[PDB]
Design a protein around this nucleic acid. Structure first.
Lengths: 100, 100, 50, 151, 209, 137
RNA sequence: GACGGAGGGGUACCACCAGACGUGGAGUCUGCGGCUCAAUCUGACUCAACGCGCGCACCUCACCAGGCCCGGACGCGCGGAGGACCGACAGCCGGGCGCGCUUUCGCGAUCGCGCGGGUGGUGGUGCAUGGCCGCUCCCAGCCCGUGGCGCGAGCCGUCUGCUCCAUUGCGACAACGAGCGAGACCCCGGCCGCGGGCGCCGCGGGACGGCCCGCGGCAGCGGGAGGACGGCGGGGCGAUAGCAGGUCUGUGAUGCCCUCAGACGCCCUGGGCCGCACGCGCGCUACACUGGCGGGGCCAGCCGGCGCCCGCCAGGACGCGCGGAGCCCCCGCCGUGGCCGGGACCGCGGGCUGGAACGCCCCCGCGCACCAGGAAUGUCUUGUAGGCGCCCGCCCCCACCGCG
């Protein structure tokens, strides 16, 4: 699907700030939590469960994240090459820091 | 001063839950703690056919995880009850929860 | 469209928390755990043989 | 419902100095005994008359044996919880047998009566050791297994 | 009289199920740490996690950043308390006595093409150097044959049954994945001298007076 | 006590007569067709079954006293096995409508007063039920 | 070593004595074979397949009869902003789907196109495997260090003597010391302290073949007791060496081949697994008077809540903090009749869970065989068998099934 830039940014904002993402099954539970993108007229939304899965799989392929699968759950951990990716995406400076 | 507090102590191990009880009794001299109440153990019981495959005599694996709860009622000020809890010895995997 | 038809709710989907298998999901308590997967992780939970 | 948190709370104290317990396969007779008129109530029903007929004579069996006149002068509020109709009658009888003895006082004459009663009906002062056994995975009973289809 | 809903142990059950997933993840992710045991402090919503592992230096000490990343993963994956969910990492002494750290090294050594005989004997020696009274290893599977073979290497005396073994024997199973396919490493270590428990059978008589 | 002293069976049959002679309860007469609950297969042939049922139900209300009883709860006391299927017999409590009707008349005749949850025997009723037992024996 | 219809010890209701309670015979219920099929997904075949792989309206779900789309990632060359990608009103065609079409209206770099390569697949093979688990084995055996014996395979310790429930002991012995298994242990009892009570729940004792009488190198045993408790209350763990036992359809278990965009991906619909000329395995209910049937009392444990009214029930609405079997006992009716034994299909009817019966429930009909099961075999020793109910599992609804 044409994944919204708002969805994409929230995944990377959660990743840059908390340095960790996760995903469960396709069945939605109010969609994916931890990602609260807003459409300009839209109320605070949650990206469809399918949407976060495709970008993060692509990001694992690029080298943005490293994953360990436990109890049918994803366990992404930020990579340093990924910090450059997310910082460029957020047009951020190196001085800006993740919560660690 | 006299405000009642209901506290619950839950542990998988009887000895580990007993440790918290003995600690609470010692530190309850200062704030007049009530005598402990030992609840009937509520058991999560799973009897499962041991064999992953049906081949073989049907055989049953009996697994039990009885949960032990102890009840504490103190008519004492909140700082005083927090003082008993923080001071009393704490063992990992033991749960203490307070209800007013 | 495929969008409007993909996974229209037809039933509850229940899978072991550890293995994600529909068969023998187990709802006896809060543990939605596979009957075969249960035995392997019974020890970490602490379920023990009498 | 056996062994309830309060052993006897319908009646508390009120001259009930003698206390006894009779056990019979999940039948607990919590007996509250006082030195009263000499008539007794079991579960708030007269000891002489109980709903089963054949069992009524068995319920009165210890009374006549350890001196009915001795039992006269003692009132009881025994309560039996749990167990079953037969189990309940045997546990009231055990409580009744013990209940007269403790109140009488331990002396040669009490001892002589105790020996006379326990000889007449054995296991009257001794709780039945047997407790229902546990069914195993073999079949439907503690010892019984399923039929062998192919020998 | 009391109501029986008692959701107190229901909370305790989600805490114990959560400890199990934490282990599942810690075991796969912290191969370098040789992670062994986890738990949660969980005191008034402060989910401190006690983890005893051979070495936190690989996951912590990198500015302490990687340990922090894991803490954020666990709070965020369990949708629970951030900042409260710290992980307290420790170091295990006598790694030869621990089965998990020896089994985790065995799986690596075997995957690195170290010979089966020597590799099991290297682990056997670690328990003997540590002084543990008995260690065994039962690698099993397509071991150098089209058919399955089992190679058991053992040094010293190891109890096999009874209740003591549960609280006196250490068992760890790893699945190695060489080019042939799945192989199953195993380690069992028995120590009569562990914590404050005595093997029940041995009566100890030492002096005339 | 005293209610226990009368054989309860003796008291119940006499109480049905006391209800009929003294005009207490008044059998509905719509009770004719109904059988005493799902379990029963042949239906009551006694023909004084509502008077017989009423006598015990009020005695049961006295036996509980302050405990408080409910219409479904009384049916559990009157439960019997259900038979006639290949599947083995399972106990089945009685139908609520007949029992509920009996409790309604007692509240009108001052033998029942509503308590927390279920209704309990009224003080005027307590004396009448106990007085009859001692008088009968 | 395996075996003997060879001998000598033993031993076990998975063996027989002495009995019990049975099946097989009848309806039914579940599984299997056969078959029918569009599809009847299968796996498993003596013990050690066959209510087994924890309850099939859909889902599950692997199967069919039709369809939907990518969930081909990430990388190299090539094309692409008036558009790469990418939906859509009405009408059509079609359960249905802008599914397609006629049609004209968008999208907005989130890409196309080939390739290098993914990715999934309840596809196969448990005769490539891990893991688990069955089974030998409810077995008591299994081995070691050094020394002895033989050229070695191999022996000795590991006993052709005695006791155990037991390689359980003892007194021996070219063996002498060690282990592992059995014990021990641990959970749950039944009795006795103390501590505790929002719930009769937390730690200790007691019981040891100790004592007696024997018979005994011994090991013990055979009685007698005393003592809640007796010599193995009941279970959990269960050696070594294996098995071409079973599961790839539990498993970011997994070799390798196949499938991969019209997918063996994934959804959506409807049916399948429950179709029955059949043979069989596990159960249930019967075959009545030791019984049914109508009332009256009323006794439980695992561990668990209810009030009010409406209705023949079934069920539902309303409300809220809590509750409990059968058997049995007492009185009646039937009066040996397939009867008032027994309840099988079917004719309706009223209801529930449900998107939905093709599920269940209740009532009013109906009134199936079976009047005690042939040859064969199974289970079983004190709170035991059996009789008799309740709980819980999978559960949308449902059990005759299993755990209890």
């Amino acid at each position: 699907v044409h994944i919204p830039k708002a969805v994409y940014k929230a995944v990377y904002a959660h990743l840059y700030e908390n340095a960790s993402l996760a995903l469960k099954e396709y069945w939605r539970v109010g969609n994916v939590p931890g990602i609260t993108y807003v459409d300009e007229n839209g109320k605070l939304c949650n990206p469809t469960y399918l949407h976060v899965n495709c970008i993060m799989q692509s990001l694992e392929s690029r080298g943005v994240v490293k994953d360990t699968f436990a109890w049918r759950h994803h366990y992404y951990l930020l990579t340093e090459k990924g910090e450059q990716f997310i910082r460029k995406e957020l047009d951020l400076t190196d001085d800006v820091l993740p919560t660690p | 001063m006299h405000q009642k507090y209901t506290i619950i102590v839950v542990g998988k191990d009887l000895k580990l839950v007993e440790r918290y009880v003995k600690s609470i009794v010692k530190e309850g001299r200062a704030f007049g703690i009530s005598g402990p109440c030992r609840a009937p153990v509520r058991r999560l019981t799973i009897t499962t056919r041991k064999s992953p495959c049906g081949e073989g005599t049907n055989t049953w694996h009996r697994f039990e995880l009885r949960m032990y709860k102890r009840t504490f009622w103190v008519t004492c000020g909140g700082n005083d009850i927090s003082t008993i809890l923080s001071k009393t010895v704490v063992i990992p995997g033991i749960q203490v929860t307070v209800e007013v | 469209m495929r969008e409007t038809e993909f996974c229209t709710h037809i039933a509850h989907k229940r899978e072991c928390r550890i293995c994600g298998n529909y068969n023998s999901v187990y709802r006896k308590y809060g543990l939605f755990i596979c009957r075969r997967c249960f035995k392997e992780n019974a020890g970490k939970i602490g379920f023990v043989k009498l | 419902d056996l062994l309830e948190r309060n052993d006897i709370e319908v009646r508390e104290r009120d001259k009930y100095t003698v206390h006894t317990l009779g056990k019979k396969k999940n039948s607990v007779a919590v007996a509250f005994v006082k030195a009263g008129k000499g008539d007794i109530l079991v579960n708030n029903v007269p000891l002489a008359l109980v709903r089963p007929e054949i069992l009524r004579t068995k319920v009165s069996e210890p009374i006549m044996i350890l001196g009915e006149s001795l039992f006269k002068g003692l009132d009881m509020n025994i309560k039996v919880a749990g167990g079953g109709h037969v189990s309940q009658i045997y546990a009231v009888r055990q409580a009744i047998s013990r209940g007269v003895l403790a109140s009488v006082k331990d002396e040669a004459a009490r001892s002589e009566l105790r020996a006379k009663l326990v000889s007449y009906d054995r296991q009257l002062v001794v709780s039945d050791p047997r407790r229902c056994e546990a069914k195993k995975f073999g079949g439907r009973g503690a010892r019984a297994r399923r039929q062998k289809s192919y020998r | 009289r009391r109501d029986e809903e008692n959701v107190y142990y229901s909370k305790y059950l989600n805490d114990c199920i959560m400890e199990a997933e934490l282990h599942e993840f810690f075991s796969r992710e912290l191969v370098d740490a040789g992670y062994a045991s986890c738990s949660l402090c969980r005191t008034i919503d402060s989910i401190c996690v006690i983890i005893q592992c051979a070495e936190p230096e690989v996951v912590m000490g990198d500015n302490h950043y990687r340990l922090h990343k894991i803490e954020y993963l666990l709070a965020g994956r369990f949708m629970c308390d951030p900042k409260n969910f710290n992980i307290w990492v420790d170091k295990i002494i006598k790694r030869g006595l621990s089965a998990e750290i020896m089994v985790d090294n065995l799986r690596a050594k075997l995957e690195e093409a170290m010979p089966i005989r020597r590799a099991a004997y290297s682990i056997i020696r670690t328990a003997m150097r540590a002084g543990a009274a008995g260690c065994e290893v039962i690698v099993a599977g397509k071991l150098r044959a089209q058919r399955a073979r089992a190679n058991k290497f053992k040094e010293g005396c190891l109890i096999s049954t009874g209740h003591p073994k549960r609280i006196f024997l250490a068992e760890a199973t790893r699945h190695i994945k060489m080019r042939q396919g799945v192989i199953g490493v195993k380690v069992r270590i028995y120590n009569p001298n562990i914590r404050g428990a005595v093997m029940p059978d041995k009566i100890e008589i030492g002096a005339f007076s | 006590s005293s209610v226990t002293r009368v054989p309860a069976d003796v008291f119940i049959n006499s109480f049905a007569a006391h209800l009929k002679n003294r005009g207490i309860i008044k059998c509905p007469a719509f009770t004719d067709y109904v059988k005493t609950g799902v379990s029963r297969q042949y239906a009551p042939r006694d023909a004084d079954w509502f008077y017989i049922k009423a006598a015990s139900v009020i005695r049961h209300f006295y036996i509980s006293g302050s405990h408080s009883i409910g219409v479904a709860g009384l049916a559990r006391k009157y439960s019997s096995l259900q038979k006639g299927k290949t599947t083995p017999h399972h106990t089945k409590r009685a139908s609520c409508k007949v029992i509920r009707s009996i409790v309604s008349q007692f509240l009108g005749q001052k033998l029942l007063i509503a308590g927390e949850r279920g209704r309990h025997i009224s003080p005027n009723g307590r004396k009448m039920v106990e007085d009859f037992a001692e008088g009968l024996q």
